[PDB]
Structures are given as C-alpha cells and as structure tokens.
Amino acid sequence: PGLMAQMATTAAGVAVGSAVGHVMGSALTGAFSG
Amino acid sequence: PGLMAQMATTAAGVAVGSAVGHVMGSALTGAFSG
Amino acid sequence: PGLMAQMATTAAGVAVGSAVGHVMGSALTGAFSG
Amino acid sequence: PGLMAQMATTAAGVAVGSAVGHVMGSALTGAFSG
Amino acid sequence: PGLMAQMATTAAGVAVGSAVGHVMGSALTGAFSG
Amino acid sequence: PGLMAQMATTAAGVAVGSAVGHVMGSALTGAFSG
C-alpha cells in the first residue's frame, strides 16, 4: 500500500480565520486501546 | 491500494471565517478499541 | 484500489462564514470498535 | 452594538462530508475598496 | 461595540471530512484597498 | 470597542479531516493597500 493511515482526531474550540470574542475548548481522545 | 485511510474525526465549537461573540466546544473520541 | 477510505466524522456547533452571537457544541464519536 | 460584522465570503470547489472523485475551485474576492 | 469585524474570506479547493481523489484550488483576495 | 478586526483571509487547497489523494493550492492576497 502506498499510504496506510489510521487517524483519530479530536478538535474543540478551534477558530480559523475568525474574529472571536472568547473561545473555550475541551477535548479528550482514547485511541488504539488494547 | 494507493491510499487506505481509516479516520475518526470529532470537531466541536469550530469557527471558520466567522465573527463569533463566544465559542464553546466539548469533544470526545474513542477509536480503534480492541 | 486508488483510494480506500473509511471515515467517521462528527461535527457539532460549527460556524462557517457566519455571524453568530453564541455557539455551543458537543460531539462524541465511537468508531472501529472491535 | 453587541456584534457588528461586515463579511464578504467566497467559496469555490468545497466538499463537506462528501465522496468526490475530483474537485476544482477558483475563487476571487474584492471587498472594502475605497 | 462588543465586537466589530470586517472580514473578507476566500476559500478554494477545500475538503472537510471528505474522501477526495484530487483537489485543485486557486484563490485571490483584494481587500481594504485605499 | 471590545474587539475591532479587519481580516482578509485566503485559503486554497485546504484539506481538513479528509482522505485526499492529491491536493493542489494557489493563493494570493492583496490587502490594506494605500
């Protein structure tokens, strides 16, 4: 395989190119648990 | 295979190119659990 | 295969190019569970 | 005023949660010209 | 004013949570010209 | 004013949480010209 990817992404309180007065973010990730 | 991808994406409180007074975000991810 | 993708996407409280007074978002994802 | 926003947004070739073979996009913006 | 925002946003060839074979994007912005 | 923002944002060939085979992007910005 040219590219194999198993990705677990978590995003909270993300501002991209924005005019935001206040940002709050809480993120939790549990991945690849045996 | 040229590209194999197993992706689990979680987004909360995301502002993109926006004028937001206040942003709140809470995100949780559980992936690839055995 | 040129591109194989198994994607689980969750979005909550997303503002794109918007004028929003207040944004609330809660997202949870469970994927690829054995 | 609580929130005053003058926004000029341009989007071309945008794929959101989609399975697209090929995407082409050309965008131009002229804003707030004196 | 609590929040004053003059925003000029340009997006081309944007893929969000998508399985895309190929993405092409060309974006140009002219803003706040005197 | 609590927050004054004059923003000129340009995005091309942006992939967010996506499985993309190939991404091409060309972006140009001209802002705040006298």
Residue numbers in the entry:
A (entry chain D), B (entry chain E), C (entry chain F), D (entry chain C), E (entry chain B), F (entry chain A): 42 to 75
Please quote the authors directly.
Using cryo-EM, we observed several distinct D10-NT fibril polymorphs (see Methods section on Cryo-EM sample preparation and data collection) and determined three different structures. The first structure we obtained (polymorph-1, 2.31 Å resolution) revealed an ordered core formed by residues P42-G75 and containing two identical protofilaments (PFs) related by pseudo-21 helical screw symmetry. Each PF contains three beta-strands, extending from residues M45 to A53, V55-V57, and V64-A72. Strand-2 forms part of a beta-helix-like turn structure, commonly observed in amyloid fibrils, connecting the first and third strands. The interface between these PFs is formed primarily between the tip of each beta-helix and the N-terminal half of strand 1. Strand-1 adopts a very similar conformation to that observed in the D10-NT PF1 structure, as do the last five residues of strand-3, and the two strands pack together in a nearly identical manner in both structures, with residue F73(D10)/F84(D2) packing against the equivalent Q47(D10)/Q58(D2) residue. Similarly, the location of the equivalent residues in the D10-NT PF1 fold suggests that it could accommodate D2 molecules. In the case of p.G66V, the PF2 or PF3 structures could potentially accommodate the mutation, but it would not be consistent with the PF1 structure and would therefore be expected to eliminate some of the possible WT PF folds.
